[PDB]
C-alpha cells in the first residue's frame, strides 16, 4: 500500500513557568516511532516502536542534537511571533509544525509536506512544488520573505526527496511485519431499542490497522449521511483502531438498513445487517 512519514512538533510558551516546552513525535503511517520532550528528566530521542530500536548510537545522537537545537530555535520563533502579532510577553502561545513525505504503492515519492501553525491557525506552508510558499497573513509573509532570501525551500526539497524517502523505505523494511500488515476490521451490528417504535442500529468496526476506514449506513440502498451518528476513529491502545456508525430506525424496518465497510485490509467492501 501507500505509506507516509511525518514529524509533529509542538512548542508551547508558559510565561512565569520556565522556558517554552518543545515536544517532537515521529510517525510512520499510524505508528509512532520516536518522541522527544524538552521537559524530560534527560531530554533525548526515545524509541516508541520495536523496529527503531536497532538503530545505532549515531542515529540517536543525530536526532537528539536536532531536537535539542530545535528546542532553542522554537523558543526564538515564539519570541519572533510575539513581535509579528504585536503581542505581549504575558500570554501562552503555541507553534506547531508537521512535515514529511508520502510514498505511493510502488515506493515512489507522491508528495512532500511542510506546514506550520501559530495558536492553532495555519501560518505558512511549503507548496506541493517544494519550491514556493503560501503565507496565511501579513506576519507569515515576513517569514516567507526571509525564507525566500535564504533559499530554505531548496534545502527542504532536498530532505523531502532524499533522506525522508530513504529513511521511510528503511523503516518500512525493518518494520515490515507490522508497518506492511493491514489488520481488517472485525465487524458486527448491535440493536438497542429506544422506544416502542424505534431502535438504534450500531455498526461496529474493531481491531483494524491502519486507521483509515469508511463506515456507512444505507436505507433501501441510499446513503443515510445526514441521519448517521459517526464517532471519530479512536485508538484501542494495542496499535489498532475502533469506530462505529449508528442510525435510529423504525421498529420493523431494520432489514431495510445495511452497513457498508471499506478498509484496505478487506479484499472487497463488506455489507452487514442486523442479524437477530
Amino acid at each position: 500500500g501507500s505509506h507516509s512519514m511525518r514529524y509533529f512538533y509542538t512548542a508551547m510558551s508558559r510565561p512565569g513557568r520556565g522556558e517554552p516546552r518543545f515536544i517532537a513525535v515521529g510517525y510512520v503511517d499510524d505508528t509512532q516511532f520516536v518522541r522527544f520532550d524538552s521537559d524530560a528528566a534527560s531530554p533525548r530521542t526515545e524509541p516508541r516502536a520495536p523496529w527503531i530500536e536497532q538503530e545505532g548510537p549515531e542515529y540517536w545522537d543525530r536526532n537528539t542534537q536536532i531536537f535539542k537545537t530545535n528546542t532553542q530555535t522554537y523558543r526564538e520563533n515564539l519570541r519572533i511571533a510575539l513581535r509579528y502579532y504585536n503581542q505581549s510577553e504575558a500570554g501562552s502561545h503555541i507553534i506547531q509544525r508537521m512535515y514529511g513525505c508520502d510514498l505511493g504503492p510502488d515506493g515512489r515519492l507522491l508528495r512532500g509536506h511542510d506546514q506550520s501553525a501559530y495558536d492553532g491557525k495555519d501560518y505558512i506552508a511549503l507548496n506541493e512544488d517544494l519550491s514556493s510558499w503560501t503565507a496565511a497573513d501579513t506576519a507569515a509573509q515576513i517569514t516567507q520573505r526571509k525564507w525566500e532570501a535564504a533559499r530554505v525551500a531548496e534545502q527542504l526539497r532536498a530532505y523531502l526527496e532524499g533522506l525522508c524517502v530513504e529513511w521511510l523505505r528503511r523503516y518500512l523494511e525493518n518494520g515490515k511485519e507490522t508497518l506492511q500488515r493491514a489488520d481488517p476490521p472485525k465487524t458486527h451490528v448491535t440493536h438497542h431499542p429506544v422506544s416502542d417504535h424505534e431502535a438504534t442500529l450500531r455498526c461496529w468496526a474493531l481491531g483494524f490497522y491502519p486507521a483509515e476506514i469508511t463506515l456507512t449506513w444505507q436505507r433501501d440502498g441510499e446513503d443515510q449521511t445526514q441521519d448517521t451518528e459517526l464517532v471519530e476513529t479512536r485508538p484501542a491502545g494495542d496499535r489498532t483502531f475502533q469506530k462505529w456508525a449508528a442510525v435510529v430506525v423504525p421498529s420493523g424496518e431494520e432489514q431495510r438498513y445495511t452497513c457498508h465497510v471499506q478498509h484496505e485490509g478487506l479484499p472487497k467492501p463488506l455489507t452487514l445487517r442486523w442479524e437477530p
Partner: peptide
C-alpha cells in the same frame, strides 16, 4: 529521521 531547522521565523 528528522531534518534540521534552516532559519528562524
Amino acid at each position: 529521521q528528522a531534518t534540521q531547522e534552516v532559519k528562524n521565523w
